[PDB]
């Protein structure tokens, strides 16, 4: 119903105007010391973290360039973006080596020296994206800088794909832990995102053409080769691995203590899923490619999050479950909500079954009406299957507004093409 | 025996001190346009073609530099290897766009500005070769420059390997004789060559690693699954493509009328695969590792050359043949006796068996006796198979003392690491 559409659309347009965004800008900018600051506690004050991780600093980058050329922000966040673009060039940027560092201090000071590809696709995902939103060529020279490194000492010429953890001199890491002898979804799926900005500022071929690499190997490497779902993690060889947690971690260790086979190790993330179909779809849109030149990946990406991930009941999706369809974990996590957001819409776009956008419904009433803490306007990280915060943390290193402020611009945005 | 392989040692060190070396010495240096001379007659006299190849100036610096670093050349061929590789840099390299040109006229000009990753190679063996050679810093930095751009353009993070011809902007040629659409056994084979060089002079662990990628796509892709040889060309994704000619050739297209099965489309070059065969055991030298850890792969290669391709009735290797075990084509080429030479040599140290010895003995009689044109130092670069030159020319643009000189140099090597 385009009432109902509109409800929808106007809902996020009042939440992303007057209580998102109002919550970063008033916060976030670092005059002192340059960079941002992210970490917040549930009443919005600091938690006093003396971080300013790459993850933080370039998603930020990203958020405050892409909500500017959307139109948001009310102009102020291109600016905030190149006070962003100053502080990871100046004091993040490996100026003997080259690669963005991946942790430094409150004050700039490097703290993690090693060159972690997981932080160096959003560096060319944010400073593609900069540069798209500013016209600041720095953006896209570090980026493309970034990229150039990234084919030289990442990119496997055997196996394909990319070694993910690097020291500082971009000699390999070690096995194991270390991140050196794995390939993974996180990394993969993201430079797909990262290229297909960056495909979009440059416009050369070589772009274009290491994106459409990144999507076969996701599509063929990575998701099952029956289901569809993402594999976290893979050897070199790209036979799956048994799942490990790195040293280097960008997100909280969750353990749902009520969660199903624990030692399963055939987990999917509806949210990863989702975000993958929805970034491919959007890279064919970049690409100018159908849709249906993955139509058998998408659909299976989507079909498997509907049918298993969302909570019908309570509203949200779950964190993870089995590749054959059991769910694991039915707690409700943030940024899995978000990518549901963009990933149902953009399903019911090309599948164009209602089902669909009853998941979106359901999601988008889960984030309005219990996830999102209205009251500072960001979003409670962690939850129970029916609401109520597990985590009540607001911000920090790896939580800021990268997932929920793209989610509600790409869903209005979304939301407007299926009234039309 | 020790006494007939001093023989066939001072046959080899006489002929390349008094022959073969002289021959280029007294000709090629031009010091008007700068760069080399390289086409001549039979007569040893200038043959008139306006053209200094990438490869041509690419190998004759790779020659001059191995063969001053092995001692050779009177002390003169040092300053020899600056000179081209001056020329190189100052009229061979892109300096907008990167990477060496193919071909440059007489006077420096060039010519065709399309960068064929077959003599990137080159460059990146000969550069690196320079500097271990001399010291001089810009053969690493340029052969480096060339690596990194080669990573950046021409490698398939998917399907993994290397595109192999690209326009001078660095985007990828068109399909089909264009050469943007096929792996070849004639590129991948010499990158391992190229790579070795690179990271002996280096030592980096990005271009350690890389070599053994290198390694591993000859042993896993490019060789055949079951008798090892080589196959000359492949699809992208590694499936076996037809033989075709690219527009851009490095070498003179020779029809044997009486060749057998002209449209058989499983041949097999024994000159490449002891060429493979001895350079990858040189990558394990300079790897420090065993020669057994590609013991079956090593193996394969010098039983199929040492029981197909070597003339034990009149000498020397035939051209090409039948992965299976037929000869097709039975004449005589300068080059592949050179690496004949080499591995013939390296499979005896590897395998002990006298037939490889017996083997090195037929094609090193053949080579003196047959191929070699005394009266002016340089080999015949086509032969019927019982001798009798077919083409007389000495040199050109894919001819000049690549092949010869190190087959030389490595033969007194290894005969005289089989004396000891
Ligand atoms: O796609 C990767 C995933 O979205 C992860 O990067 C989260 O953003 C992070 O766990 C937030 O804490
Ligand atoms: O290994 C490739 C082969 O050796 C080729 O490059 C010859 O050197 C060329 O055909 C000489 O004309």
């Not at 993850?55 to 959307?70: D, E």
């Not at 309005?368 to 990280?381: A, Q, R, T, V, Y």
Request: charged share 25%; with cysteine; aromatic share 14%.
């Amino acid at each position: 119903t385009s009432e109902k559409i509109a409800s929808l659309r106007q809902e996020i347009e009042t939440y992303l105007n007057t209580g998102l965004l109002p919550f970063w800008i008033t916060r976030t900018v670092d005059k002192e010391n340059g960079g941002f600051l992210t970490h917040f506690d549930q009443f919005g004050n600091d938690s006093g973290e003396d971080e300013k991780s790459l993850i933080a600093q370039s998603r930020s980058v990203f958020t405050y360039s892409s909500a500017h050329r959307a139109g948001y922000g009310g102009g102020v966040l291109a600016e905030m973006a190149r006070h962003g673009v100053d502080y990871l060039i100046n004091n993040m940027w490996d100026n003997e080596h080259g690669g963005f560092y991946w942790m430094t201090n409150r004050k700039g000071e490097v703290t993690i020296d090693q060159k972690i590809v997981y932080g160096l696709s959003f560096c060319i995902y944010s400073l593609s994206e900069y540069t798209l939103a500013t016209g600041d060529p720095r953006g896209r020279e570090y980026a493309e800088k970034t990229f150039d490194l990234l084919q030289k000492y990442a990119v496997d010429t055997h196996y394909g794909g990319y070694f993910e953890m690097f020291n500082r001199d971009w000699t390999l890491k070690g096995p194991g832990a270390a991140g050196g002898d794995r390939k993974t979804l996180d990394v993969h799926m993201h430079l797909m995102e990262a290229y297909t900005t960056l495909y979009e500022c440059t416009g050369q071929e070589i772009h274009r053409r290491k994106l459409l690499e990144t999507i076969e190997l996701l599509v063929n490497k990575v998701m099952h080769p029956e289901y569809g779902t993402g594999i976290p993690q893979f050897w070199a060889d790209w036979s799956v691995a048994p799942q490990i947690k790195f040293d280097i971690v960008w997100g909280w260790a969750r353990f749902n203590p009520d969660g199903l086979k624990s030692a399963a190790e055939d987990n999917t993330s509806y949210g990863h899923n989702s975000e993958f179909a929805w970034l491919l779809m959007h890279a064919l849109d970049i690409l100018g490619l159908p849709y249906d030149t993955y139509r058998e990946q998408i659909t299976k990406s989507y079909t498997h999050a509907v049918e298993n991930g969302v909570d019908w009941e309570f509203g949200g999706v779950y964190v993870e479950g089995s590749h054959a369809g059991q769910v694991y974990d039915k707690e409700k996590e943030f940024w899995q909500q978000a990518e549901m957001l963009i990933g149902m819409l953009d399903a019911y776009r090309f599948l164009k079954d209602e089902k669909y956008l009853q998941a979106y419904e359901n999601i988008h009433r889960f984030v309005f009406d219990k996830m999102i803490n209205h009251s500072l306007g960001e979003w409670w990280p962690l939850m129970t299957r029916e609401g109520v915060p597990i985590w009540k943390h607001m911000s920090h290193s790896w939580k800021i507004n990268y997932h929920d402020v793209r989610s509600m611009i790409q869903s209005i945005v979304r939301l407007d093409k299926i009234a039309k």
